[PDB]
Design an enzyme around this catalytic site. Sequence first.
Site, PDB file in Angstrom:
ATOM      1  N   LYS A   1      -3.970  26.886 -12.465  1.00 40.51           N
ATOM      2  CA  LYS A   1      -5.347  26.492 -12.819  1.00 40.51           C
ATOM      3  C   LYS A   1      -5.477  26.292 -14.329  1.00 40.51           C
ATOM      4  O   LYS A   1      -5.799  25.223 -14.803  1.00 40.51           O
ATOM      5  CB  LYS A   1      -6.419  27.533 -12.375  1.00 40.51           C
TER       6      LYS A   1
ATOM      7  N   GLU B   1     -11.841  22.215  -6.566  1.00 38.49           N
ATOM      8  CA  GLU B   1     -11.777  21.310  -5.440  1.00 38.49           C
ATOM      9  C   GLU B   1     -13.112  21.257  -4.689  1.00 38.49           C
ATOM     10  O   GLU B   1     -13.626  20.187  -4.395  1.00 38.49           O
ATOM     11  CB  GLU B   1     -10.630  21.715  -4.497  1.00 38.49           C
TER      12      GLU B   1
ATOM     13  N   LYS C   1     -16.838  31.336  -2.282  1.00 42.23           N
ATOM     14  CA  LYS C   1     -17.175  32.677  -2.800  1.00 42.23           C
ATOM     15  C   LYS C   1     -17.712  32.618  -4.238  1.00 42.23           C
ATOM     16  O   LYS C   1     -18.750  33.196  -4.530  1.00 42.23           O
ATOM     17  CB  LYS C   1     -15.959  33.615  -2.728  1.00 42.23           C
TER      18      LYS C   1
ATOM     19  N   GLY D   1     -11.491  36.321   0.426  1.00 41.21           N
ATOM     20  CA  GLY D   1     -11.527  35.002   1.053  1.00 41.21           C
ATOM     21  C   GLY D   1     -10.691  34.893   2.324  1.00 41.21           C
ATOM     22  O   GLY D   1     -11.160  34.492   3.385  1.00 41.21           O
ATOM     23  N   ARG D   2      -9.424  35.260   2.221  1.00 42.14           N
ATOM     24  CA  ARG D   2      -8.532  35.162   3.362  1.00 42.14           C
ATOM     25  C   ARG D   2      -8.900  36.167   4.456  1.00 42.14           C
ATOM     26  O   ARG D   2      -8.259  36.195   5.514  1.00 42.14           O
ATOM     27  CB  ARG D   2      -7.106  35.386   2.907  1.00 42.14           C
TER      28      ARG D   2
ATOM     29  N   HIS E   1      11.920  22.112  20.637  1.00 41.88           N
ATOM     30  CA  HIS E   1      12.639  20.871  20.473  1.00 41.88           C
ATOM     31  C   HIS E   1      12.771  20.510  19.019  1.00 41.88           C
ATOM     32  O   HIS E   1      13.311  19.441  18.707  1.00 41.88           O
ATOM     33  CB  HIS E   1      11.898  19.742  21.140  1.00 41.88           C
TER      34      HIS E   1
ATOM     35  N   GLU F   1      -0.540  35.451   0.857  1.00 39.46           N
ATOM     36  CA  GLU F   1      -1.461  35.632  -0.263  1.00 39.46           C
ATOM     37  C   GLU F   1      -1.767  37.127  -0.483  1.00 39.46           C
ATOM     38  O   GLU F   1      -2.048  37.543  -1.589  1.00 39.46           O
ATOM     39  CB  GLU F   1      -2.726  34.827  -0.042  1.00 39.46           C
TER      40      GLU F   1
END
Lengths: 557, 557
Positions: A519, A217, A211, A272-273, A389, A358
């Site tokens: 950040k 990253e 975006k 974004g999400r 399990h 978020e």
Amino acid sequence: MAALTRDPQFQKLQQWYREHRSELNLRRLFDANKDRFNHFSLTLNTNHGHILVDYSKNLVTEDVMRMLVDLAKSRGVEAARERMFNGEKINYTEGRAVLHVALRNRSNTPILVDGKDVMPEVNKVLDKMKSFCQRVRSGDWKGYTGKTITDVINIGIGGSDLGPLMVTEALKPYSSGGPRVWYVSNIDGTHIAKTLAQLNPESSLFIIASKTFTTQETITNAETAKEWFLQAAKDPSAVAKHFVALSTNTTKVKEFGIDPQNMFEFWDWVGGRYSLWSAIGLSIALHVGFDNFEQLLSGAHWMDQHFRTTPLEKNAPVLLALLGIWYINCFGCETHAMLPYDQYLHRFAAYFQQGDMESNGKYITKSGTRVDHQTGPIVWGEPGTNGQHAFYQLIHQGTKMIPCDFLIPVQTQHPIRKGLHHKILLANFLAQTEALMRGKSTEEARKELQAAGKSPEDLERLLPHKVFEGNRPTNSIVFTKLTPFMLGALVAMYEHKIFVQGIIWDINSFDQWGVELGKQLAKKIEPELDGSAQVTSHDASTNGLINFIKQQREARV
Amino acid sequence: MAALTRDPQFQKLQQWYREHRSELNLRRLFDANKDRFNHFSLTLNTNHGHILVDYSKNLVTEDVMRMLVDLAKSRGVEAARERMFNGEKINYTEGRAVLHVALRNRSNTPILVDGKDVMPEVNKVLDKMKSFCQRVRSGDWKGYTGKTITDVINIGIGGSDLGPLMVTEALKPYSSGGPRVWYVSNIDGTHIAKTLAQLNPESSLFIIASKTFTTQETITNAETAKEWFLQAAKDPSAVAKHFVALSTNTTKVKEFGIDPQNMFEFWDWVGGRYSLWSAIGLSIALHVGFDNFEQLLSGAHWMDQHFRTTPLEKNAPVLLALLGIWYINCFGCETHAMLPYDQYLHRFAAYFQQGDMESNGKYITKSGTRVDHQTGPIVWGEPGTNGQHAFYQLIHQGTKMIPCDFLIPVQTQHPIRKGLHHKILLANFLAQTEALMRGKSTEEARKELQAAGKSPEDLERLLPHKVFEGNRPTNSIVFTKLTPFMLGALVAMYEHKIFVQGIIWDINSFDQWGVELGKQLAKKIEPELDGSAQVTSHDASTNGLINFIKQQREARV
Ligand SMILES: O=C[C@H](O)[C@H](O)COP(=O)(O)O
Ligand SMILES: O=C[C@H](O)[C@H](O)COP(=O)(O)O
């Protein structure tokens, strides 16, 4: 005192919880009303499969459901819903509209922000994605030595990663004739390096999903990838055939070296999400095709209408939300489990871990007031039956109340052995909720032990360990089949569930300030890592950690 | 009244918490004691890498740590530990020894069970595994048409699935020369079908991994794989060359059709979720070599010893455990996040989601009385830095307290860009815990907004959303490099962590009666799914669901 604790309906709900809690036993509720399923389940016909939302195994009564709905009327869910759909700027801290619903607005009914319709730009990018997909999938688009693209590499993190990944995983059966897709996100060099080691640069298309186009990253990975590509191609101009961008930032894209014709755009109002429905979904369309991509949007649109026209009391996302509020703010449960009985949906829990946490892991209300009640739960899960399990042991016999969503498709993509595998899967799906509701009493367990031929001695020592107190509530969400359309409807359903929760908590479901601090702090530490000198400019833990890193960097093992 | 709550040391802790918790603030504890890092950290030298367990950013003082150790003593952790290491049947409800330590006992010190040293049978299986690995990896072991093995498929679920999956994912770099590994586990046909489709039966070796060799999901997948194999080779005798078994039940293995010589055995004292160290770990050994497997076992052997011989107050797993008890039993935190900053460890949280929760998801103590306190937490997590963009928003600014474990290796397996990717990853690892600890005050945030040029109205509306309360506790676990040895030590470290908590809570971490009820009820349901008649034999929800599934299995979407 936040808006929610001040709300009389909310207060009424707490009151009732205090008074009747003990009156909420499922086994008794189901024995006392043979019609429970019928009063506490939704059957939705989309014309492309049905969705059964069975909330009957919940700790609720009609009276409870009524108040829960009244809480929603009182907290203004409808009005809030309309502001979203009308393009109002409900993301009030960033000053933005929230229009994931415009991305899949198949009706093309105008949606205006600042008195301007967004459907055209929306549709203009969809047409660009579409042409581009055709050209890539058919082989019309070729690499720098003229080969067809066999591998597509999305590079992005968070919202620019998880959706496309989860959806290409869930719709893998529809990728025939699609290039392979790879999702690189972590800054950890392992991620890019083990991916690149498996590709031919000649036949690889990199999609830089971001975006802001400044996220550390994604930019570093993009740069790394570009450097590897040029190691092989050597000619800067070859980049235009192997790199494209999904962004809102033409400038940052232009400066990274990407052709402006190679940018698929989206908007500040696309969270974004909440972004897979947009240009961010490019990789989904490359993989399963653009028609199937349109089918996904189209299923979101359907659920979007349901949210919009259905009365609150029968409205699916609204009900899942309210049940969550019941469990979070009255019962105090910290978590919500999402357990798809479907291997294709193996990243479904993880996607909504981001989507829910978020959005609603917040503590400041619209009035700028600190909440004095819980907000979003911790969301987690793994597909069934594997979980049976692994952690169901605790869900069954631990000390936590864990509301759980069980999901499954009626028809499998892979009906092997004449459906035997699906048959079993379905059986466990049904069985596990039954068990969690029903439990198994001391006496039930006692009778089982007697019949087994145990001595009153071995029986006495073992007995209490085979008792299940039951009364663990679940939701069961069943759908005809997991197609692109149905997945879209499901994804959309939780989104809106999240929205509702957030309006009730008076928080902003659409910003995410919580990421800044780390950040900022990351930028401080990076330069402090180079060199042998000890670091003493932080609290003693951070220094100690840094000094151990420097010391150990030199160890040979 | 359970053993824990009646215990006096525990009552002291609760009492200290009741009276002092308001004073537990990380900023202040660090400003007041420049030695906090030295005093609340452990640095361990394994001789094959160092482990720094830094627990200084926890809400604890010297007094608290002293009382927690006292609690471990008062609860009898050392005696319990010894009973386990000595072969005693501490798995009391099944009358079993618990001896995952014997499997990686490289010292071959005799360990007896009912008077017999188990070490010889453990070492025989290991020699056998080694011979197989060398024959398979080297090309000596041919398929039914004379080709070397290129692919190994493990079929099993839970304890017979997750460990070897996790470990192979984590040690991928040590797999040069090894065959590919595949993990089929879910009963959902998607899993075996999507796998078989990528396989050549001439070059594929199957491993049926199952302690009991009767688990439904596993036997069925096994049948499905065997059927698939037979369609191509048309020769029952070829099975001996493409199917081995990892189990403790020779009978059912013979019945399945696997040659007794193709059976790698283990014992009942090996828990599923503690089995990767055994024959269950054959896929590990196949993929990265018996040498590396051995290194994995010693790393664990080392940690076992550390756990056995270190005084409590400096014992890594014990301290991890006590901190957990403190957050679980005093603070009341339902969850524990494990956040490895390592893409290779992407299944690490999931593995311990099982190991922790299946072990201590319990409510019945040794005396047979109900606990009246919390036991096991819900374990969850995804690798960093991806989390920073997903659920970290909630950890930073939600309304839940969530103890987190941050893990990272100092040395990466892929030092690309001259280490740039790894430098950033570390920077973030460090800065995230710093930030959870420090937060950012209103005052601090205001200064940042003023410095950014925001108007008084801009700043006023945004300010409170930008405040981070901080005081969020973490452990940082930093180790030299993620080699097979170190991995063994780290898995072993959490294994003993879980043990200690189990002892303190006075529960059995090594039984799992909780899976039974569901299993029973699914056996009932299977047959009722056949045919199209309505079912009315269960509760209304179970009924409605079955009927809906029956209605819809015949819809054409
Ligand atoms: O998930 C959070 C964001 O989507 C993530 O930080 C990526 O942001 P970006 O799309 O600007 O790169
Ligand atoms: O985790 C639970 C057990 O490991 C799982 O149910 C498998 O048991 P099995 O190895 O006997 O098949």
